[PDB]
Amino acid sequence: SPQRGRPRLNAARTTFVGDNGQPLRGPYTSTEWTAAAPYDQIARVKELGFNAVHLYAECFDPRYPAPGSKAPGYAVNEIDKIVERTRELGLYLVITIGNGANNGNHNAQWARDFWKFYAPRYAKETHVLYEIHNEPVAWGPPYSSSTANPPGAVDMEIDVYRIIRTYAPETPVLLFSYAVFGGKGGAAEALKDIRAFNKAVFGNENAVWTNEAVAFHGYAGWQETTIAVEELLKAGYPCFMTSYAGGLDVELTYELERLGVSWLTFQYIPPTGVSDDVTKPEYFSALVENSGLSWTPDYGNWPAARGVYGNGGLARETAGTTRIEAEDFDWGGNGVSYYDTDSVNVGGQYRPDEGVDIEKTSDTGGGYNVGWISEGEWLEYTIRVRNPGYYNLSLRVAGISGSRVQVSFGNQDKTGVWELPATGGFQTWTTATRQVFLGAGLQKLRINALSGGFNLNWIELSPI
Ligand SMILES: OC[C@@H]1O[C@@H](O[C@@H]2[C@@H](O)[C@@H](O)OC[C@H]2O[C@@H]2OC[C@@H](O[C@@H]3OC[C@@H](O[C@@H]4OC[C@@H](O)[C@H](O)[C@H]4O)[C@H](O)[C@H]3O)[C@H](O)[C@H]2O)[C@H](O)[C@H]1O
Ligand SMILES: O[C@@H]1[C@@H](O)[C@@H](O)OC[C@@H]1O
Ligand SMILES: [Ca+2]
Ligand SMILES: [Ca+2]
Ligand SMILES: [Ca+2]
């Protein structure tokens, strides 16, 4: 069977991982007011490096159970199709209740009845996880405050959890689905909610969860959301991102990858959804490609295996001058993180098992330079620009004759043709500088050798 094995908490207790130990990563679809996305459209997520699908299954009715209100269960035939199609495609599925125009709200009786019907229905589907309710409170913790808008969401979480565990004893549960989860303060407020949940459900405020995690969204922004997640992780509670958007929020994704946290992004499986289509490059694949983000996919060969050389495998951050040694190009290999015309490293130095040609340099500071740079060659360096704006881009270069380079950032040309002066010698060094406008974020710096005949020691960036 291609059916995926039950997700489980990882050893580090940071998130749910799959049957191969890898995080869950995926886009979303909806059966709230539309049919289930076709099989071939769901299949496309496998080629975009994903192994999961977020389903907004049904939208709640605030008026329920008043006359003419829409009851839960209306989409059952469409949800069954999503469950079957994900089963057969070897994908994980996270099912939740959506809100339509009523995000930051819920109807407790509607939620209890929804889960009463659906929990037993998919209990045995080992690829299916249950997320209690999307964004049930405007707009994050503490739900347990008597003045939360609206009140009683923790009672709903408790009640639905018990319903789920009665009929689906082994099914992973994602709790809270906080819209705005930000700062040490946010984590502290979430811990009030968690402690109250745990006391009611486990009889002990400090329960060690075996099959539950905190669902959250990214609307506090990447930095504050990352702080809040790190706090919650330190407190011993796993989490799972279920909805965020920047297109892909590359910055938060990078942080979640570092922290070992699974994620579902708010771009949709075609034909339809309320945001942006995940198969259009401008909303996902190009953002991943341009940034240098990498993970090992469950299916296919994309994204490429690559990353930062040195610096603990983390993106080199700008401030203040930031130096990137030419010899510290990203790992990933020929045609991926660099292109060299011969697979031998002719200089033999520093990285003898990659193709870039590297020699000891006599330049100030010593170390190494890239040499034997031939027309068409290129080198990539994954960096992170905190502050958007104009920077001085400096190349430390040498050459007997003049040469031409062009430098891209996130696959956008920032320099045009850049004529590098002859210095009269391959170890006679000069600094060439050009102003560039850089956008904020994780991005690959690419040196493109338009001609050969120059050596490159290092690259510098500093604000003008
Ligand atoms: O279908 C998914 C939808 O997304 C969920 O909200 C997310 C939230 O989880 C997080 O990721 O932040 C972004 C939120 O997205 C906003 O969601 C609401 C949406 O506007 C509503 O769109 C639906 C409209 O109504 C339906 O239209 C079709 C019709 O046939 C039906 O009867 C209508 O009810 C509604 O009036 C809009 O306010 C924004 O466009 C989007 O950015 C939601 O919980 C889930 O429903
Ligand atoms: O540094 C240079 C190299 O770039 C090449 O062009 O000739 C050999 C020297 O070591
Ligand atoms: Ca070579
Ligand atoms: Ca070369
Ligand atoms: Ca160097």
Residue numbers in the entry: 37 to 282, 291 to 363, 372 to 516
Reproduce passages from the article:
A third product complex was generated by co-crystallizing the nucleophile inactive mutant CtGH5E279S-CtCBM6 with a WAX-derived oligosaccharide. The data revealed a pentasaccharide bound to the enzyme, comprising β-1,4-xylotetraose with an Araf linked α-1,3 to the reducing end xylose. The xylotetraose was positioned in subsites −1 to −4 and the Araf in the −2* pocket. In the active site of CtXyl5A the α-d-Xylp, which is in its relaxed 4C1 conformation, makes the following interactions with the enzyme: O1 hydrogen bonds with the Nδ1 of His253 and Oϵ2 of Glu171 (catalytic acid-base) and makes a possible weak polar contact with the OH of Tyr255 and Oγ of Ser279 (mutation of the catalytic nucleophile); O2 hydrogen bonds with Nδ2 of Asn170 and OH of Tyr92. O3 (O1 of the Araf at the −2* subsite) makes a polar contact with Nδ2 of Asn139; the endocyclic oxygen hydrogens bonds with the OH of Tyr255. The Xylp in the active site makes strong parallel apolar interactions with Phe310. A surface representation of the enzyme shows that O3 and O2 of xylose units at subsites −2 to −4 are solvent-exposed and are thus available for decoration. Indeed, these pyranose sugars make very weak apolar interactions with the arabinoxylanase. At −2, Xylp makes planar apolar interactions with the Araf bound to the −2* subsite. Xylp at subsites −2 and −3, respectively, make weak hydrophobic contact with Val318, the −3 Xylp makes planar apolar interactions with Ala137, whereas the xylose at −4 forms parallel apolar contacts with Trp69.
